[PDB]
Amino acid sequence: MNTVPFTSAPIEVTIGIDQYSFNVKENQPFHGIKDIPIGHVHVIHFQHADNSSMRYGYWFDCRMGNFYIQYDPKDGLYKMMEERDGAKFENIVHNFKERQMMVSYPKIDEDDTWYNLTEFVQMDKIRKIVRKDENQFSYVDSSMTTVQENELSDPAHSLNYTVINFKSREAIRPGHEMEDFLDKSYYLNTVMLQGIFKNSSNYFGELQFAFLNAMFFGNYGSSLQWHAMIELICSSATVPKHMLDKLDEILYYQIKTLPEQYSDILLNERVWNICLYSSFQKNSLHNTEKIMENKYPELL
Amino acid sequence: GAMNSSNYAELFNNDIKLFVDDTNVYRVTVHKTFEGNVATKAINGCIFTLNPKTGHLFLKIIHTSVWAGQKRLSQLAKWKTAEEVSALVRSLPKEEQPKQIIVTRKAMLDPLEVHMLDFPNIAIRPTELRLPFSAAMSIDKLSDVVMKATEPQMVLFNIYDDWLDRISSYTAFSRLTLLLRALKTNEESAKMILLSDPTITIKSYHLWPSFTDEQWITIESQMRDLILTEYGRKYNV
Ligand SMILES: CCC[C@H](C)N(C)S(=O)(=O)c1ncn(C)c1Cl
Numbered sequence: 137m138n139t140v141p142f143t144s145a146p147i148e149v150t151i152g153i154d155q156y157s158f159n160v161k162e163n164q165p166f167h168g169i170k171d172i173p174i175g176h177v178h179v180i181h182f183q184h185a186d187n188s189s190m191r192y193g194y195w196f197d198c199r200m201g202n203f204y205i206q207y208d209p210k211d212g213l214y215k216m217m218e219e220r221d222g223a224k225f226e227n228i229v230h231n232f233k234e235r236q237m238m239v240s241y242p243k244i245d246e247d248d249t250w251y252n253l254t255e256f257v258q259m260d261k262i263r264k265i266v267r268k269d270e271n272q273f274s275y276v277d278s279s280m281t282t283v284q285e286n287e288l289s290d291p292a293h294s295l296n297y298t299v300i301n302f303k304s305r306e307a308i309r310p311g312h313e314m315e316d317f318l319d320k321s322y323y324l325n326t327v328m329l330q331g332i333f334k335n336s337s338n339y340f341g342e343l344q345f346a347f348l349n350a351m352f353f354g355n356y357g358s359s360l361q362w363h364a365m366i367e368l369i370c371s372s373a374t375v376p377k378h379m380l381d382k383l384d385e386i387l388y389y390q391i392k393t394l395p396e397q398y399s400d401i402l403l404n405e406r407v408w409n410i411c412l413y414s415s416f417q418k419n420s421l422h423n424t425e426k427i428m429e430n431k432y433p434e435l436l
Numbered sequence: 437g438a439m440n441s442s443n444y445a446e447l448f449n450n451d452i453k454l455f456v457d458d459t460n461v462y463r464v465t466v467h468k469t470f471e472g473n474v475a476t477k478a479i480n481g482c483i484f485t486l487n488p489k490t491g492h493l494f495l496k497i498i499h500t501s502v503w504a505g506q507k508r509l510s511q512l513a514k515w516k517t518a519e520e521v522s523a524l525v526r527s528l529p530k531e532e533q534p535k536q537i538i539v540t541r542k543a544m545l546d547p548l549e550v551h552m553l554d555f556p557n558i559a560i561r562p563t564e565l566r567l568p569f570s571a572a573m574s575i576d577k578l579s580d581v582v583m584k585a586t587e588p589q590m591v592l593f594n595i596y597d598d599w600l601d602r603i604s605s606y607t608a609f610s611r612l613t614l615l616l617r618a619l620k621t622n623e624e625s626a627k628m629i630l631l632s633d634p635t636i637t638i639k640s641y642h643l644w645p646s647f648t649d650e651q652w653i654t655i656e657s658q659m660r661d662l663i664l665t666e667y668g669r670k671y672n673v
Pocket of ligand 1: 490492531
């Protein structure tokens, strides 16, 4: 079990750790988060009590280093940092636990939610979507735009998601205009899966990462990306059976985990009704369609 | 964005454009089968492509053979339309190519956008006008070439005859739309109006009779009356 210690908590902030969150008061004696499950990526995220504008956070994998949080009073935010002195780190963390100034990652033993939301997400891929190679963790916030959004402005602070565009020469083979636009199998299987992603796990990993950034940060370009990657599968007549079955599981847990009140901005009516009721795969997402209809019947 | 009353005169500026109407691409007669069920029998159609500034109508005749063994023909028709338009844009040199194509039905936007990806600098636009181009098959010489075709064919027509010799393209487009609106609302009355007087002939190279200016004003008046009336006759007013 790993730990992300905090130097202190100088400003009042709602701190999130994966799907959990807790309020820390200004200068409350908070020294971070323990018992973080090894083997998964994690995200620790922040919303200041003073400025609910800009949720922000850090994706990290505790196997990649010892990481801590330290508030920066100049830049005005909780910053993740790496401690290279492993001995110094263990020592500090041991002390903080002794004084019990750390919250415990509150994982219920029945609960596979986080595994199921991050099954295919890998830090190495996160770090290529979020380019900042001096660090082993990745900063995202609400306002970051995607490489695709910049085509339609600072390239350093972008989300370099894979550009999907259904009305593009990459999506459409000369000679199969109608065929490729109505059945996107070529674009999914040849261009994207075989060509760019290499395999369905990397595709699902980006899809899952896009959703989580949309959910935790209200990142609009991420939500667009999540929906694009869903729609590309649902609009392909030819999809490996294992991908469909796993897609259904992936989306099920995303829909299950979405806050009830946020469904109106994070869920594209057109994409979902098309995917559940018009697309080739309208009959192939049984779990997703059942949870959607019982939880968000309004949208449909 | 969309073409409407407010940007109406853009049609007559010096940026070459085309209006594309697909309403006569896929045409069927509906009949009863021996077993008493219903079947369709396709008949030849056309893509009504009009340069609204000069008058040229690049009529691409859609022979029934293009539908043989195809499913979802109303959807294919939009893509066939797009494919034929794209082919015209490609055959043309860059300077002669249209800067914009306006489709008369929004269902053509995606098919044409997709077929025109090779031409990202050609704007594809819808319109909010209810243009009467579906009545182009009520022009006898156009209907005739379409029904007689035995193979795919493209025939170039001037839908303004020689009018631009005397009137502007704004005025010629208005005359055309009035004539087509009339023909669409009551083709019989409309055609009687146009051909009542034997002495006024349709030149062999023309589509409409050789009306003088004064005769066009009477004609245009009568077509208005027709359209106003048919509108009464319809709503009882
Ligand atoms: C998109 C339109 C392309 C054609 C080739 N034009 C340039 S035209 O419609 O003005 C035209 N001008 C003269 N002709 C005989 C034609 Cl036809």
